[PDB]
Design a protein around this ligand. Structure first.
Ligand SMILES: Cc1cn([C@H]2C[C@H](OP(=O)(O)O)[C@@H](COP(=O)(O)O)O2)c(=O)[nH]c1=O
Ligand SMILES: [Ca+2]
Length: 129
């Protein structure tokens, strides 16, 4: 997998962000995770976490996996990095997302994320509390 440049356009909620990628605006859905809807418990905290993480980054990168790069809604499917730290993994580590939507072929970082979820769950963090 390879990191590609992109710039924040707008952080949308816990697991979707609008980015400019190859000069075009596009909404990205973070691979392998599910954050609560803004309306649900921990939804505003997940949104706020992704917003700070992405808004504070000097450098945003997108990393596509091996399979599908867009979903059925035209959203990009990627791992998103903020100054070298993976937002997908960070949300899970904090108990603000669950590992979810693991489809074969787009699951390179599954193990890493499950490992983070185990630690979040052990700590009874946020969603696990
Ligand atoms: C994360 C991810 C979501 N999706 C689709 C599945 C879900 O379809 P349905 O909308 O039909 O439930 C939806 C969940 O996204 P959200 O969690 O953003 O709503 O996005 C993919 O198809 N591939 C993916 O990798
Ligand atoms: Ca969601």
């Amino acid at each position: 997998l390879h990191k590609e440049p992109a710039t924040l356009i707008k952080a949308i909620d816990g697991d979707t962000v609008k980015l400019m990628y190859k000069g075009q605006p596009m909404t990205f859905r973070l691979l392998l995770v599910d954050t609560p809807e803004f309306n649900e418990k921990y939804g505003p905290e997940a949104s706020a976490f992704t917003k700070k993480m992405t808004e504070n980054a000097k450098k945003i990168e997108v990393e596509f996996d091996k399979g599908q790069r867009t979903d059925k809604y035209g959203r990009g499917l990627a791992y998103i990095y903020a100054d070298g730290k993976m937002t997908n993994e960070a949300l899970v580590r904090q108990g603000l997302a669950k590992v979810a939507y693991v489809y074969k072929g787009n699951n390179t970082h599954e193990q890493l994320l499950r490992k983070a979820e185990a630690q979040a769950k052990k700590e009874k963090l946020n969603i696990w509390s």
